[PDB]
Amino acid sequence: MKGTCHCGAVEIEVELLNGFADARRCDCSFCRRRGAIAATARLSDLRVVRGAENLTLYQFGTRTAKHWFCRTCGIYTHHQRRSNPEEYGVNVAILEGVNPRDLGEVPWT
């Protein structure tokens, strides 16, 4: 499944752990500001195809979670959850063929 930021500078290759069945929405001070809907993915299921040099890393608080976003279009691609260092949180909207609207209402973690 292909993932790409808007600028198109960044492209990932990720396999979702359990599809979109569990797409939630963290409402913490940071996630509430991101606004994206995420889905899990094992560390060994995500691969940065291109644009690794165009991504920005953001850490805070425990500096456990790793958040990445395209420096050009500012689009949040994925992040390394702070609850599970063996998982990634992916922006469903960057996934090819996925219109977030079609997911309908989604909870808030």
CSV table of all heavy atoms in Angstrom, one decimal, residues 71-108:
chain,number,residue,atom,x,y,z
A,71,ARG,N,8.9,18.4,5.2
A,71,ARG,CA,9.3,19.7,5.4
A,71,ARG,C,8.8,20.7,4.4
A,71,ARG,O,8.7,21.9,4.6
A,71,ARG,CB,10.9,19.8,5.4
A,71,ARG,CG,11.5,19.5,4.1
A,71,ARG,CD,13.0,19.2,4.2
A,71,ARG,NE,13.8,20.4,4.6
A,71,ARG,CZ,14.0,21.5,3.9
A,71,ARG,NH1,13.5,21.6,2.6
A,71,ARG,NH2,14.7,22.5,4.4
A,72,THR,N,8.3,20.2,3.2
A,72,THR,CA,7.8,21.0,2.2
A,72,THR,C,6.3,21.3,2.3
A,72,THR,O,5.9,22.5,2.3
A,72,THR,CB,8.1,20.4,0.8
A,72,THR,OG1,9.5,20.1,0.7
A,72,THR,CG2,7.7,21.3,-0.3
A,73,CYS,N,5.5,20.2,2.3
A,73,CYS,CA,4.1,20.4,2.4
A,73,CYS,C,3.5,20.3,3.8
A,73,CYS,O,2.4,20.6,4.1
A,73,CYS,CB,3.4,19.4,1.5
A,73,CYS,SG,3.9,17.6,1.7
A,74,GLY,N,4.4,20.0,4.7
A,74,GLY,CA,4.0,19.9,6.1
A,74,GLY,C,3.1,18.8,6.5
A,74,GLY,O,2.6,18.7,7.6
A,75,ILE,N,2.9,17.9,5.6
A,75,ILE,CA,2.0,16.8,5.8
A,75,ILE,C,2.6,15.6,6.7
A,75,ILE,O,3.6,15.1,6.4
A,75,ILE,CB,1.5,16.1,4.5
A,75,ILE,CG1,0.7,17.1,3.6
A,75,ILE,CG2,0.7,14.9,4.7
A,75,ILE,CD1,-0.5,17.7,4.4
A,76,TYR,N,1.8,15.3,7.7
A,76,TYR,CA,2.2,14.3,8.7
A,76,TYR,C,2.1,12.9,8.0
A,76,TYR,O,1.0,12.5,7.6
A,76,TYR,CB,1.4,14.3,9.9
A,76,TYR,CG,1.0,13.0,10.6
A,76,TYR,CD1,2.1,12.3,11.2
A,76,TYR,CD2,-0.3,12.6,10.6
A,76,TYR,CE1,1.8,11.1,11.8
A,76,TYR,CE2,-0.6,11.4,11.3
A,76,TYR,CZ,0.4,10.6,11.9
A,76,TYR,OH,0.1,9.5,12.6
A,77,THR,N,3.2,12.2,7.8
A,77,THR,CA,3.2,10.9,7.2
A,77,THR,C,3.0,9.7,8.2
A,77,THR,O,2.0,9.0,8.1
A,77,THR,CB,4.6,10.6,6.5
A,77,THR,OG1,5.7,10.8,7.4
A,77,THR,CG2,4.8,11.5,5.3
A,78,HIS,N,3.9,9.6,9.2
A,78,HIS,CA,3.8,8.5,10.2
A,78,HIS,C,4.6,8.9,11.4
A,78,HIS,O,5.3,9.9,11.5
A,78,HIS,CB,4.4,7.2,9.6
A,78,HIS,CG,5.9,7.3,9.3
A,78,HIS,ND1,6.4,8.1,8.4
A,78,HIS,CD2,6.9,6.6,9.9
A,78,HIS,CE1,7.7,8.0,8.4
A,78,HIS,NE2,8.1,7.1,9.3
A,79,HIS,N,4.5,8.1,12.5
A,79,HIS,CA,5.2,8.3,13.7
A,79,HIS,C,5.3,7.0,14.5
A,79,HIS,O,4.5,6.0,14.3
A,79,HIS,CB,4.4,9.3,14.6
A,79,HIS,CG,3.1,8.8,15.1
A,79,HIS,ND1,2.0,8.7,14.4
A,79,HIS,CD2,2.8,8.3,16.4
A,79,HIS,CE1,1.0,8.2,15.1
A,79,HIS,NE2,1.5,8.0,16.3
A,80,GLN,N,6.3,6.9,15.4
A,80,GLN,CA,6.6,5.8,16.2
A,80,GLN,C,5.9,6.0,17.5
A,80,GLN,O,6.4,6.7,18.4
A,80,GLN,CB,8.1,5.6,16.4
A,80,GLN,CG,8.4,4.4,17.2
A,80,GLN,CD,9.9,4.2,17.4
A,80,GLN,OE1,10.6,4.0,16.5
A,80,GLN,NE2,10.3,4.2,18.7
A,81,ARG,N,4.7,5.4,17.7
A,81,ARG,CA,3.9,5.5,18.9
A,81,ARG,C,4.8,5.5,20.2
A,81,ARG,O,5.9,4.9,20.2
A,81,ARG,CB,2.9,4.3,19.0
A,81,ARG,CG,1.8,4.3,17.9
A,81,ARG,CD,0.8,3.3,18.2
A,81,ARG,NE,-0.3,3.3,17.2
A,81,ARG,CZ,-1.1,4.3,17.0
A,81,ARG,NH1,-0.9,5.4,17.6
A,81,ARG,NH2,-2.0,4.2,16.0
A,82,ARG,N,4.2,6.1,21.2
A,82,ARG,CA,4.9,6.2,22.5
A,82,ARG,C,4.5,5.2,23.5
A,82,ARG,O,5.1,4.9,24.5
A,82,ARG,CB,4.8,7.6,23.1
A,82,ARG,CG,5.1,7.7,24.6
A,82,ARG,CD,5.1,9.1,25.2
A,82,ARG,NE,5.1,9.1,26.6
A,82,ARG,CZ,4.0,8.9,27.4
A,82,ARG,NH1,2.8,8.7,26.8
A,82,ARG,NH2,4.1,8.9,28.7
A,83,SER,N,3.3,4.5,23.1
A,83,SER,CA,2.8,3.4,23.9
A,83,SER,C,3.5,2.1,23.5
A,83,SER,O,3.8,1.2,24.3
A,83,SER,CB,1.3,3.3,23.8
A,83,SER,OG,0.9,2.8,22.5
A,84,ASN,N,3.7,2.0,22.2
A,84,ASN,CA,4.4,0.8,21.6
A,84,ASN,C,5.5,1.2,20.6
A,84,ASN,O,5.3,1.5,19.5
A,84,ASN,CB,3.3,-0.1,20.9
A,84,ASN,CG,3.8,-1.5,20.8
A,84,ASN,OD1,5.0,-1.8,20.7
A,84,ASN,ND2,2.8,-2.4,20.8
A,85,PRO,N,6.7,1.1,21.1
A,85,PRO,CA,7.9,1.3,20.3
A,85,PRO,C,8.1,0.4,19.1
A,85,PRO,O,9.0,0.6,18.3
A,85,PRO,CB,9.1,1.2,21.3
A,85,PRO,CG,8.4,1.7,22.5
A,85,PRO,CD,7.1,1.0,22.5
A,86,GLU,N,7.2,-0.6,19.0
A,86,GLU,CA,7.3,-1.6,17.9
A,86,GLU,C,6.2,-1.3,16.9
A,86,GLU,O,5.9,-2.1,16.0
A,86,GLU,CB,7.1,-3.0,18.4
A,86,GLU,CG,8.4,-3.5,19.2
A,86,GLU,CD,9.6,-3.6,18.3
A,86,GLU,OE1,9.5,-4.3,17.2
A,86,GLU,OE2,10.6,-3.0,18.7
A,87,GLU,N,5.5,-0.2,17.0
A,87,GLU,CA,4.5,0.2,16.1
A,87,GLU,C,4.7,1.6,15.5
A,87,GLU,O,5.5,2.4,15.9
A,87,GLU,CB,3.1,0.2,16.8
A,87,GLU,CG,2.6,-1.1,17.3
A,87,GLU,CD,1.2,-1.1,17.8
A,87,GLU,OE1,0.9,-0.2,18.6
A,87,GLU,OE2,0.4,-2.0,17.5
A,88,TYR,N,3.9,1.8,14.4
A,88,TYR,CA,4.0,3.1,13.7
A,88,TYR,C,2.5,3.6,13.6
A,88,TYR,O,1.6,2.8,13.5
A,88,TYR,CB,4.5,3.0,12.3
A,88,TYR,CG,6.0,2.9,12.2
A,88,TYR,CD1,6.7,1.8,11.6
A,88,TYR,CD2,6.8,4.0,12.6
A,88,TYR,CE1,8.0,1.8,11.4
A,88,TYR,CE2,8.2,4.0,12.4
A,88,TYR,CZ,8.8,2.9,11.8
A,88,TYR,OH,10.2,2.9,11.6
A,89,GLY,N,2.3,4.9,13.6
A,89,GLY,CA,1.0,5.5,13.4
A,89,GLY,C,1.1,6.1,12.1
A,89,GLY,O,1.9,7.0,11.8
A,90,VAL,N,0.2,5.6,11.1
A,90,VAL,CA,0.2,6.2,9.8
A,90,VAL,C,-1.0,7.1,9.5
A,90,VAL,O,-2.1,6.8,9.9
A,90,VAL,CB,0.3,5.1,8.7
A,90,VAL,CG1,0.4,5.6,7.3
A,90,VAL,CG2,1.5,4.2,9.0
A,91,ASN,N,-0.7,8.1,8.7
A,91,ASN,CA,-1.8,9.1,8.3
A,91,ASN,C,-2.6,8.4,7.2
A,91,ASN,O,-2.1,8.2,6.0
A,91,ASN,CB,-1.1,10.3,7.7
A,91,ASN,CG,-2.1,11.5,7.6
A,91,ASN,OD1,-3.3,11.3,7.2
A,91,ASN,ND2,-1.6,12.7,7.8
A,92,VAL,N,-3.8,7.9,7.5
A,92,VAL,CA,-4.6,7.2,6.5
A,92,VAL,C,-4.8,8.0,5.2
A,92,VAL,O,-5.0,7.5,4.1
A,92,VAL,CB,-6.0,6.9,7.1
A,92,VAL,CG1,-5.9,6.1,8.4
A,92,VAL,CG2,-6.8,8.1,7.3
A,93,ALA,N,-4.9,9.4,5.3
A,93,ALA,CA,-5.1,10.2,4.2
A,93,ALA,C,-4.0,10.2,3.2
A,93,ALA,O,-4.2,10.7,2.0
A,93,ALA,CB,-5.4,11.6,4.7
A,94,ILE,N,-2.8,9.8,3.5
A,94,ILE,CA,-1.7,9.7,2.6
A,94,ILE,C,-1.7,8.4,1.8
A,94,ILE,O,-1.1,8.3,0.7
A,94,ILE,CB,-0.3,9.9,3.2
A,94,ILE,CG1,0.0,8.7,4.1
A,94,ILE,CG2,-0.3,11.2,4.1
A,94,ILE,CD1,1.5,8.6,4.5
A,95,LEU,N,-2.4,7.4,2.3
A,95,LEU,CA,-2.5,6.1,1.6
A,95,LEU,C,-3.3,6.2,0.3
A,95,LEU,O,-4.4,6.8,0.3
A,95,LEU,CB,-3.3,5.1,2.6
A,95,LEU,CG,-2.7,4.9,3.9
A,95,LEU,CD1,-3.5,3.9,4.7
A,95,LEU,CD2,-1.2,4.4,3.8
A,96,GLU,N,-2.7,5.7,-0.7
A,96,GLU,CA,-3.2,5.8,-2.1
A,96,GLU,C,-4.6,5.2,-2.2
A,96,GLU,O,-4.8,4.0,-1.7
A,96,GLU,CB,-2.3,5.1,-3.1
A,96,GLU,CG,-2.8,5.1,-4.5
A,96,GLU,CD,-1.7,4.8,-5.5
A,96,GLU,OE1,-1.0,5.7,-5.9
A,96,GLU,OE2,-1.5,3.6,-6.0
A,97,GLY,N,-5.6,5.9,-2.7
A,97,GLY,CA,-6.9,5.4,-2.9
A,97,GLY,C,-7.8,5.6,-1.6
A,97,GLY,O,-8.9,5.0,-1.6
A,98,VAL,N,-7.3,6.3,-0.6
A,98,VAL,CA,-8.1,6.4,0.6
A,98,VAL,C,-8.5,7.9,0.9
A,98,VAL,O,-7.7,8.8,1.1
A,98,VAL,CB,-7.2,6.0,1.8
A,98,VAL,CG1,-8.1,6.2,3.1
A,98,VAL,CG2,-6.8,4.5,1.7
A,99,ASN,N,-9.8,8.1,0.9
A,99,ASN,CA,-10.4,9.4,1.2
A,99,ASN,C,-11.0,9.2,2.6
A,99,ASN,O,-11.9,8.5,2.8
A,99,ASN,CB,-11.6,9.7,0.2
A,99,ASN,CG,-12.1,11.1,0.4
A,99,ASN,OD1,-12.3,11.5,1.5
A,99,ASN,ND2,-12.3,11.8,-0.7
A,100,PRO,N,-10.3,9.9,3.5
A,100,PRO,CA,-10.7,9.8,5.0
A,100,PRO,C,-12.2,10.0,5.2
A,100,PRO,O,-12.8,9.4,6.1
A,100,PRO,CB,-9.9,10.9,5.6
A,100,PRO,CG,-9.7,11.9,4.5
A,100,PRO,CD,-9.4,11.0,3.3
A,101,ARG,N,-12.9,10.8,4.4
A,101,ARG,CA,-14.3,11.0,4.5
A,101,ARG,C,-15.1,9.6,4.5
A,101,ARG,O,-16.0,9.4,5.2
A,101,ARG,CB,-14.9,11.9,3.4
A,101,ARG,CG,-16.4,12.0,3.4
A,101,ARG,CD,-16.9,12.0,1.9
A,101,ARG,NE,-16.5,13.2,1.2
A,101,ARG,CZ,-17.1,14.4,1.2
A,101,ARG,NH1,-18.2,14.5,1.9
A,101,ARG,NH2,-16.6,15.4,0.5
A,102,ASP,N,-14.7,8.7,3.6
A,102,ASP,CA,-15.3,7.4,3.4
A,102,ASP,C,-15.2,6.5,4.6
A,102,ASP,O,-15.9,5.5,4.7
A,102,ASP,CB,-14.7,6.7,2.2
A,102,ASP,CG,-15.0,7.5,0.9
A,102,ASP,OD1,-16.1,7.8,0.6
A,102,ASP,OD2,-14.0,7.7,0.1
A,103,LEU,N,-14.4,6.9,5.6
A,103,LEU,CA,-14.3,6.1,6.8
A,103,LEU,C,-15.4,6.4,7.8
A,103,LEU,O,-15.6,5.7,8.8
A,103,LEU,CB,-12.9,6.3,7.5
A,103,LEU,CG,-11.6,5.8,6.8
A,103,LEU,CD1,-10.4,6.1,7.7
A,103,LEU,CD2,-11.7,4.3,6.7
A,104,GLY,N,-16.1,7.5,7.5
A,104,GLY,CA,-17.2,7.9,8.4
A,104,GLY,C,-16.7,8.3,9.8
A,104,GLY,O,-15.5,8.5,9.9
A,105,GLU,N,-17.6,8.4,10.7
A,105,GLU,CA,-17.2,8.8,12.1
A,105,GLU,C,-16.1,7.8,12.6
A,105,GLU,O,-16.1,6.6,12.3
A,105,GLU,CB,-18.4,8.8,13.0
A,105,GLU,CG,-18.1,8.9,14.5
A,105,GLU,CD,-17.4,10.2,14.9
A,105,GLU,OE1,-18.1,11.2,14.8
A,105,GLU,OE2,-16.3,10.2,15.3
A,106,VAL,N,-15.2,8.3,13.4
A,106,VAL,CA,-14.1,7.5,14.0
A,106,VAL,C,-13.9,8.0,15.4
A,106,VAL,O,-13.8,9.2,15.7
A,106,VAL,CB,-12.8,7.6,13.2
A,106,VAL,CG1,-13.0,6.9,11.8
A,106,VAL,CG2,-12.4,9.0,13.0
A,107,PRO,N,-13.7,7.1,16.4
A,107,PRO,CA,-13.4,7.4,17.8
A,107,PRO,C,-12.2,8.3,18.0
A,107,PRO,O,-11.5,8.7,17.1
A,107,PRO,CB,-13.2,6.0,18.4
A,107,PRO,CG,-14.1,5.1,17.6
A,107,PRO,CD,-13.7,5.6,16.2
A,108,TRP,N,-12.0,8.6,19.3
A,108,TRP,CA,-10.8,9.4,19.7
A,108,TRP,C,-10.1,8.6,20.8
A,108,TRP,O,-10.7,8.4,21.9
A,108,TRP,CB,-11.3,10.8,20.3
A,108,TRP,CG,-11.9,11.7,19.3
A,108,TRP,CD1,-13.2,11.6,18.8
A,108,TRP,CD2,-11.3,12.8,18.7
A,108,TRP,NE1,-13.4,12.7,17.9
A,108,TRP,CE2,-12.3,13.4,17.8
A,108,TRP,CE3,-10.1,13.5,18.8
A,108,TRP,CZ2,-12.0,14.6,17.1
A,108,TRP,CZ3,-9.8,14.6,18.0
A,108,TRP,CH2,-10.8,15.2,17.2
